[PDB]
Design an enzyme around this catalytic site. Structure first.
Site, mmCIF file in Angstrom:
data_model
loop_
_atom_site.group_PDB
_atom_site.id
_atom_site.type_symbol
_atom_site.label_atom_id
_atom_site.label_comp_id
_atom_site.label_asym_id
_atom_site.label_seq_id
_atom_site.Cartn_x
_atom_site.Cartn_y
_atom_site.Cartn_z
ATOM 1 N N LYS C 158 -83.813 78.944 6.540
ATOM 2 C CA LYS C 158 -82.698 78.575 5.997
ATOM 3 C C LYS C 158 -82.864 77.342 4.829
ATOM 4 O O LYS C 158 -82.206 77.276 3.887
ATOM 5 C CB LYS C 158 -81.737 77.785 7.111
ATOM 6 N N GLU C 184 -76.634 64.465 10.382
ATOM 7 C CA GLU C 184 -78.102 64.792 10.453
ATOM 8 C C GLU C 184 -78.807 64.410 11.723
ATOM 9 O O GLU C 184 -78.706 63.353 12.284
ATOM 10 C CB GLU C 184 -78.637 63.834 9.097
ATOM 11 N N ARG C 185 -79.817 65.328 11.954
ATOM 12 C CA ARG C 185 -80.442 65.252 13.369
ATOM 13 C C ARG C 185 -81.449 64.117 13.294
ATOM 14 O O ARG C 185 -82.066 63.954 14.244
ATOM 15 C CB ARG C 185 -80.823 66.580 13.805
#
Ligand SMILES: Nc1ncnc2c1ncn2[C@@H]1O[C@H](COP(=O)(O)OP(=O)(O)OP(=O)(O)O)[C@@H](O)[C@H]1O
Ligand SMILES: [Mg+2]
Lengths: 166, 338, 355, 84, 167, 119
Positions: C158, C184-185
């Protein structure tokens, strides 16, 4: 222990005022001053109670409550504190005045307009509600006859209804 | 009394437009700006659903008229309105400019031109929410409107005064068949006989502005801008605008219907109309119903659609044809709104 | 001039209530500011509660707050530093560089709350945009100014698709993409930044082609609902003042919808359908209408969409479906076994594929 | 503490659904607006704050590490539930 | 109808207009179900520790303009309506260090294993922000769980978050 | 008798609140009257709110309702024409002939709200 229960809902202010008066003194002076204040606010209704609208800022409320205390500082005792607390809280000051009057009259007057089957208006200026109602009713029936209009009294109509129902 | 009089006089200042001037009888004061509502103190001669200006260009129409203040919904973004602002009543129920000066132009839910082609010529201003004709004035449908589709012509025929519903999924061609109808109207819209002339109205509820622009371009290509009016309520618009647009378009069509002519109106995506009404209702603390839709979702569509029927000869034998568009989600016609 | 000041009255969760003085209340969506030892806590005004009190939502952690602390009104909405200087820097929702590479030297400062271009300014022609990827620009071509929805997953490349799109748009016309990592991680974010430096798209010493704006998942709700608006403002400036065909990447539009529903619950609004905010459609339209093509330039958004419970009928997926044009369903190892793009051409569809 | 002191530590959060239930109890008892199955709003924010604290520090800071192993129990296999 | 009822509710119920200096102290207004509304504490902080007259501690989640909603770490039996309450001045914190090894403690650092006092190298806040985006690095060191299924198919790394989801 | 008159205080959608005067409170389910420019707007009383205020239901649209408008009490429930003359006449929720076939010449008028016929 105030004589009557106002059950809050904007009425706790009156009970607080009465308790503050009862703790030390001046059950009457504060109340007569408040009566004068209500007379003043109803003197100029377009400037009196329209100014109790909620679209009116906090320091506006301070200005109006400062404007209330004039004419030889009629606001005597803790009623000035009541005006202050009403400035930073709920504004319009008519209903709790009536509640406080109701409380002080129970303290001193104990008058109720009973008559059961009779729609009289017999106010009773006595704390003993035992037989003075007889004299009050006799005086109010001998003279006046304010309304005394049951239109139709309940027992005969309700009895006829239940009899014809079987 | 002199001291009380002068202190009351100085009280009359610095309160300004809350009790002093106009007596807040034809004016108001914003008490609090909510989700999409604006509690306004004052406006003592206000009537219900009366259009009001918030001194910022945004419009408003009154639902709540409880004794204390008036609850006003916001016809636009609520950022413009501010607590303590002065509002003034326009003195008229919510209305849209109607007349034969609207064909070839696109407007919003308030009739304000958006195409940038200049001001709108109006023959009148009918109320957005008007009472539908009764039982007496109507007459059974007899004149056929030709859609140009063999499926819709030979089968499922549609007549002037009939409300035919276009149901389908997201990508099925509902807009396609509506556009085919509006373009097929060109055959008789370029003649002289007014009985066969069918003017058209397109309603854009929650659609993309880009899609509306492409649609306008398509009508441009096939010379369909004439005899057609487009009211636009994009997805970025406020929910009240979307909720109001169909009624205003109904008024536009009813002008032609009551003037003896015949009009086509297409209610594209009334499902998003119901969604906007649901948003407005739950922002008004109204009890949710089935799928949280407020109970008056049926009443909305009912009052909206029943304003389109064939008139009898005594009125003028006018007609209004409604073509609602509902997007069934999952290919099911057993859902509440469908 | 005299700054607008007030006092904090209550902090309820992320919701902060502040009392102002007479004729000093700002409009809603405006940015507020308090001096905390950590930094700048900024408050976005949501509602006016009367009595000169406003209800605001915190964009940063509200810990150790005391009633009666001083607050200052900026004057307008949250304004993000905007310009060509943003390229190569990591910026947040509040417009502060979290890249610790010095301050942002942008000359202009635009608010994040703006209106979509009017109907007249909207382009009246459906335009095609070359993607570089053969299968993409043949079988599911992207719309110039479209709302492409990436239906991918994990271990499907991705990201590499994203960097390939950025490079292709930079080479082709003018592309200066803007990546918006909504939610956002902060591990994938660091890896992505390292990949940016390695791939050469982000050039620390040279010029970069993408600005990395993202609010991490640990931020309070509302910041995750405004990072997308910040990135959209950046892209709109790059379009309305340079005439480029800018791109915009959303980490997960479902996360934006979840944050929006989360904000409404905190305010007190009744969740409408499935724990969802009553203004789901309104918020989605407001976000997706400014991302459009105009007379000057165009901005095309490539958003990654997560489908809850694999349910196409869920309200948020449908609301996103209202604005997609074309879609790209990256094959979950179907075409990845072999073809590197792995786009599953029999599932990825496009509305513009017409003669 | 271990992570910032340069060591490596393993943390087992175990039951987080019960922690979310506790937060539900707190928020409801404080008259906060409820949400999906009456859960509080900032529970996603809560778990994000809890979980993002675990990280792998770089060499400049000591090259510490925190590996988080939360355990979420699902009812009836529903992985589509709000907390899951 | 000329006017309507002013108050349907009020946070202030005792309008005596006295008792200043409730910035560091307060009075319990109402208690029940593990919560206790308190009037005062004008200088209280968010989630600040607070001490009651009966010895039970509290945490200041809800600070309304009028009263502060205190969540209670113990039973509601000890507390009363009208007790005096004092703020501690510190946020949630725990004794941290290497002495915690081999010991079982409570949710606030109290030893519950009955092995003696806890040795600590410091006292960090319970609620602390996570490390930023740059001070982190990629996870490369593996965590060997001992399960061949876990260690081969779903590897765990030092600095990773892995959910054990199941019935 | 004297016409029972009051003031309209609240107009909430299809719900209208009316404040009345000393002992002038009407009955539940009793027709009220508003002189609208279009015609007659009756306000069926649903609930009593106290303080000489009653909550009413409007049988027609509440368009153009200003707070403080004069209201009139009919004195009973909604009355409709009844009899064989109604056959062939199309009537409405209030009883006005909407068939424009002339006024209805009914001999009796009965209240809308009745009771079940016992056993
Ligand atoms: N008769 C037709 N011939 C060719 N293409 C058609 C036809 N009808 C529809 N299409 C195509 O089908 C797609 C969807 O059709 P249309 O634009 O009418 O949308 P819809 O199904 O009404 O709804 P929506 O706007 O929600 O997608 C478009 O790509 C359109 O070009
Ligand atoms: Mg369509």
């Amino acid at each position: 222990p105030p004589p009557v229960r106002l059950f809050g809902v904007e009425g706790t202010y009156a009970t607080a005022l009465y308790q503050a008066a009862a703790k030390n003194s001046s059950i009457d002076a504060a109340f007569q001053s408040l009566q004068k204040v209500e007379s003043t606010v109803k003197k100029n209704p377009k400037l009196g109670h329209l100014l109790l609208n909620p679209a009116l800022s906090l320091k506006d409320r301070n200005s109006v409550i400062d404007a209330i205390v004039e004419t030889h500082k009629n606001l005597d005792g803790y009623v000035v504190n009541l005006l202050k607390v009403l400035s930073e809280n709920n504004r319009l000051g008519c209903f709790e005045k009536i509640a406080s009057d109701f409380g002080v009259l129970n303290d001193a007057h104990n008058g109720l307009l009973k008559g059961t089957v009779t729609s009289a208006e017999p106010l009773d200026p006595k704390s003993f509600k035992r037989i003075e109602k007889a004299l009050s009713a006799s005086k109010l029936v001998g003279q006046g006859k304010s309304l005394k209009l049951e239109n139709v009294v309940k027992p005969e109509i309700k009895g006829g209804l239940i009899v014809e129902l079987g | 009394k002199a001291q009380p009089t002068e202190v009351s006089s100085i009280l009359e200042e610095r309160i300004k437009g809350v009790s002093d001037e106009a007596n807040l009888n034809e004016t108001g004061r914003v008490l609090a700006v909510g989700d999409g509502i604006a509690r306004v103190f004052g406006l003592n001669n206000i009537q219900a659903e009366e259009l009001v200006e918030f001194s910022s260009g945004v419009k408003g129409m009154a639902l709540n008229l409880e004794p204390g203040q008036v609850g006003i919904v916001l016809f636009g973004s609520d950022r413009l309105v501010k607590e303590g602002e002065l509002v003034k009543r326009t003195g008229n129920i919510v209305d849209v400019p109607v007349g034969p000066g609207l064909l070839g132009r696109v407007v919003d839910a308030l009739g304000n031109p958006i195409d940038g082609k200049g001001p709108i010529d109006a023959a009148g201003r009918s109320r957005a929410q008007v009472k539908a004709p009764g039982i007496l004035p109507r007459r059974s449908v007899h004149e056929p409107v030709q859609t140009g589709l063999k499926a819709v012509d030979a089968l499922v025929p549609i007549g002037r005064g009939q409300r035919e519903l276009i149901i389908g999924d997201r990508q099925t061609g509902k807009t396609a068949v509506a556009l085919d109808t509006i373009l097929n109207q060109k055959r008789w819209n370029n003649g002289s006989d007014e009985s066969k002339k069918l003017y058209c109205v397109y309603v854009a509820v929650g659609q993309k502005r880009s899609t509306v622009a492409q649609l306008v371009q398509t009508l441009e290509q096939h010379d369909a801008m004439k005899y057609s009016i487009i009211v636009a309520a994009t997805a970025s618009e406020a929910a009240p605008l979307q909720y109001l647009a169909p009624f205003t378009a109904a008024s536009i069509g009813e002008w032609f219907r009551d003037n003896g002519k015949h009009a086509l109106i297409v209610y594209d995506d009334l499902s998003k109309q119901a969604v906007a009404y649901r948003q407005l209702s739950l922002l008004l603390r109204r009890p949710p119903g089935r799928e949280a839709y407020p109970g008056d979702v049926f009443y909305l569509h009912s009052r909206l659609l029943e304003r389109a029927a064939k008139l009898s000869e005594k009125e003028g034998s006018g007609s209004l044809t409604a073509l609602p568009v509902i997007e069934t989600q999952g290919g099911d016609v057993s859902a509440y709104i469908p | 001039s005299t700054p607008i000041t007030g006092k904090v009255t209550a902090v309820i969760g992320a919701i902060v209530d502040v009392h102002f003085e007479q004729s000093e209340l700002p409009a809603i969506l405006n940015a507020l500011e308090i001096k905390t030892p950590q930094g700048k806590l900024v408050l976005e005004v949501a509602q006016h509660l009367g009595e000169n009190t406003v209800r605001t939502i915190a964009m940063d952690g509200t810990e150790g707050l005391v009633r009666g602390e001083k607050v200052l009104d900026t004057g307008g909405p949250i304004s993000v530093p905007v310009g060509r200087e943003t390229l190569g820097r990591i910026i947040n929702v509040i417009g502060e560089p979290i890249d610790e590479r010095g301050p942002i030297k942008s000359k202009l400062r635009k608010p994040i709350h703006a209106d979509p271009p009017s109907f007249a300014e909207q382009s009246t022609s459906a335009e095609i945009l070359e993607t570089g990827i053969k299968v993409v620009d043949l079988l599911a071509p992207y719309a110039r100014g479209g709302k492409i929805g990436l239906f991918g997953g994990a271990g499907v490349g991705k990201t590499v698709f994203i960097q390939e799109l950025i490079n292709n748009i930079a080479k082709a016309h003018g592309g200066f993409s803007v990546f918006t990592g909504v939610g956002e991680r902060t591990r994938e974010g660091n890896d992505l930044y390292r990949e940016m430096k390695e791939t050469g798209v982000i050039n620390l010493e040279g010029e970069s082609k993408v600005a990395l704006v993202f609010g991490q998942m640990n931020e309070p709700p509302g910041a995750r609902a405004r990072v997308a608006l910040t990135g959209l403002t950046i892209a709109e400036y790059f379009r309305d003042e340079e005439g480029q065909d800018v791109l915009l990447f959303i980490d997960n539009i479902f996360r934006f919808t979840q944050a929006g529903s989360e904000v409404s619950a905190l305010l007190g609004r009744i969740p409408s359908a499935v724990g969802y905010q009553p203004t789901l459609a309104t918020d989605m339209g407001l976000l997706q209408e400014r991302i459009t093509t105009t007379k000057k330039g165009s901005v095309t958004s490539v958003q990654a969409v997560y489908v809850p419970a694999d349910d196409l009928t869920d309200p948020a997926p449908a609301t996103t479906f209202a604005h997609l044009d074309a879609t790209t369903v990256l094959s979950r190892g179907i075409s990845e076994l072999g073809i590197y793009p792995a786009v599953d051409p029999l599932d990825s569809k496009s509305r513009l594929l017409d003669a």
